[PDB]
Ligand binder design. Sequence first.
Ligand code: FE2
Length: 186
Amino acid sequence: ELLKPRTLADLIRILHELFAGDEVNVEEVQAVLEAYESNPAEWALYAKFDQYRYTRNLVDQGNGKFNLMILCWGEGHGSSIHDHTDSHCFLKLLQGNLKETLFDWPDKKSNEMIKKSERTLRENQCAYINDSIGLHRVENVSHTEPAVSLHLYSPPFDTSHAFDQRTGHKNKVTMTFHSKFGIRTP
Ligand SMILES: [Fe+2]
């Protein structure tokens, strides 16, 4: 029984219910994330920006099966082309817009990675990706507005690959947290 989350705290409680089991109802999780109306006062604690790149800010450690975090994208900040390490990955916009570009998994032969498609993710929308869908790059192309997004991963993961757009060659990257539960973790 999916009800509208009243607050971020309410959302988190509902997510603990949705991940109480071993499997994941993707459409239900996405629906609930989209139904939470972003309220900046509730997540200001986690919205810690860096001038030079986007930051990842742990919000909830989950129940063993998922992590919830907030990413803060300065004007012009973007990601690598990357994968999600066999996890579900939900992305909900809390503030601003992000551009998502989809790429196919490369073949072993060195080749330019060509965009499959692209879309604009707008405030309060929730997108979903997994490795079966493809790879992606996420970017704040705004010159004037910072973006903030809410990310849910299940299972949690702390490494992934970055892909060279020119060749499709990949390398493993360790994921770090800029803060945890509102506390800066240098
Ligand atoms: Fe991603």
